[PDB]
């Protein structure tokens, strides 16, 4: 009954999460896809911190644990997508020449605090978790990720097709490989103690709270940048 | 008490080993041009701004009435203002170069600056579940390693500052002077057995993490031996 409640909590949080104004904007085919991807450079901090979360926090190569070996396999691949981010950054005309300090001031912007610190908050949440509870973190976080990338892949695929270029990050191929030997949701062959159950609730609430804080920063960046667009070239 | 006395002595011990690292003998070597010794200056980017965030977000807690946490909050306020000095001296040193956004991100998230980039993250993980007296120990150790670093860098720093007649703020005596009721002064504090052992864990991890960063700085110099500073005379 416990595990079943948690998987349901994720579904409910996903349903709130997918309705955020940011995603309504990103999905809106009456606005140019070049305007809908004006939030693209905001992902910078998040994408490479996500790589680092997978490489150095999620992964433990020496674990003999059944659950940790499956995590290790999944984090191996999920940590390769940051190159896709830098690919599409270039394609979208956002790999602009600037001073080193302009890039640093951007990454450490007070207006991208939640974006920058999302993976930090996950690593802190995860520090004392047993592998089975790290799976809940990853499933929650990946449920949020599928919503974000299913939305972003809409304008991305529109630009990819129109410019005749292969987008890799804001692209259906990203959503497909991310979704995914065993998948972590399938390890719903697991039942949780009462302790684990209240912890998994805490995890899902925070993961979606922090994910909503990031998306709120994107919505506000968009708002402060409607007077520009991605500049893809044909 | 005599448990605290052991901690303050372990910090002196750890400072004495740390002071001897090859990177510091290099930075102190007046036979090498100060432009060459500050080859490592841009490495600090991946740290100075994380140090600011550590002080704003991780150490500081504005919903606390504890005596100690209130001392912490005061100290963290000033320590969080030095990142702008870092950007000042970046430009003065000629390291505020024009580049692709992606080259700035690949710099910060370089595998060759992993320990530099993660030092403050590691400190936040260590600190997040400590009582304030124990956070005071993290901060005092960190600040002890910090003094060794800025005592060394201020040598080539002040050489360039006088030679070019420009006000250097970060690799500068003024930074070394302002970093120095003070936290050590609450060595009017007695630790339990448990706190004694955790203070030992804290002081060991701070100095190990600080050694790893300095080791990366030394490897950077060796791999970038031509990329000397290029300050301009006033
Ligand atoms: N898929 C993202 C990572 C991610 C995962 C979960 C999220 O909620 C958000 C983003 C990437 O490759 O960068
Ligand atoms: N004084 C440094 C921070 C620092 C502190 C402790 C250290 O060990 C190193 C660096 C700054 O303003 O950025
Ligand atoms: Fe991904
Ligand atoms: Fe400082
Ligand atoms: Ni997977
Ligand atoms: Ni702007
Ligand atoms: Ni102080
Ligand atoms: Ni904890
Ligand atoms: Ni290099």
In angstroms, the Cα distances linking B165 to A188, B95, B97, B168 are 67, 18, 21, 9
**Does residue A27 have a known ligand-binding role?**
no
- A97 φ, ψ (degrees, to nearest 5): -75, 135
Which residue is it, tokens 């030997």?
A181
Q: B53 CB less than 6 Å from ligand 2?
A: no
C-beta separation of B156 from B27 below 8 A: yes
For residue B122, give how far its alpha carbon lies from the nearest alpha carbon of chain A (Å): 10
Whether B120 and B48 have beta carbons less than 8 Å apart is answered as no
A75 CB-contact burial (10 Å; exposed 0-12 / middle 13-18 / buried 19+)? buried
Beta strands in B5-114 (DSSP E): 98-100
Residue B145 beta carbon below 6 angstroms from any ligand 2 atom: yes
d(CA B179, ligand 4 centre) in Å? 6
Q: Ligand 2 test: best mutation among B21, B79, B210, most atoms within 8 Å of CB?
A: B79
Look up residue B224 and give its two tokens.
Answer: 């970038």
For residue A141, the ligand 1 atom closest to its alpha carbon is 8
Q: Which ligand is nearest to the CA of B52?
A: 2
Token representation of residue B52: 């600011």
Q: Could you tell me the CATH superfamily of domain B2-29+42-223?
A: Heme oxygenase-like (1.20.910.10)
DSSP string, A14-25: HHHHTTSHHHHH
A100/B105 CB distance under 8 A: no
Experimental approach taken:
X-ray
Please spell the DSSP secondary structure of A121-169, one letter per residue: HHHHHHTT--HHHHHHHHHHHHHHHHHHHHHHHHHHHHHHHHHT---SS
Tokens 């995890």 correspond to what residue? Answer: A203
Domain ranges, ordered by start, for chain B: 2-29+42-223
A165 is in an annotated binding site: no
Closest residue, chain B, to A120 (C-alpha): B121
The answer to the question of whether A160 is labelled as a binding residue is no
Partner-chain contact A41 B90, CB within 8 Å: no
Q: Which CATH number fits domain A2-223: 1.10.240.10, 3.40.50.80, 3.10.150.10, 1.20.910.10?
A: 1.20.910.10
Q: Which of B56, B98, B101 to mutate to test the interface with A (most CBs of A within 10 A)?
A: B101
């Amino acid at each position: 009954a416990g595990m079943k409640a948690i998987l349901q909590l994720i579904l409910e949080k996903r349903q709130e999460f997918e309705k955020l104004p940011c995603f309504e904007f990103v999905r809106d085919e009456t606005i140019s896809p070049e305007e809908r991807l004006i939030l693209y450079p905001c992902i910078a901090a998040f994408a490479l911190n996500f790589r680092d979360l997978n490489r150095y926090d999620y992964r433990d190569d020496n674990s003999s644990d059944y659950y940790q070996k499956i995590i290790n396999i999944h984090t191996q691949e999920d940590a390769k997508h940051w190159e896709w981010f830098l690919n599409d950054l270039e394609l979208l005309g956002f790999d602009k020449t600037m001073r080193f300090s302009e890039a640093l001031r951007f990454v450490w912007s007070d207006d991208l605090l939640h974006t920058r610190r999302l993976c930090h908050n996950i690593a802190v949440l995860s520090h004392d978790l047993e592998p089975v509870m790290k799976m809940v973190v990853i499933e929650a976080m990946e449920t949020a990720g599928l919503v974000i990338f299913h939305a972003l892949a809409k304008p991305g695929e529109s630009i990819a097709k129109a410019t005749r270029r292969k987008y890799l990050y804001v692209a259906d191929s990203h959503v497909e490989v991310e979704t995914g030997e065993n998948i972590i949701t399938i390890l719903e062959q697991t039942q949780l103690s009462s302790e684990q159950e209240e912890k998994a609730k805490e995890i899902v609430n925070k993961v979606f709270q922090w994910s909503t804080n990031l998306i709120g920063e994107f919505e506000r960046y968009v708002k402060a940048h409607r007077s520009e667009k991605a500049q893809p070239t044909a």
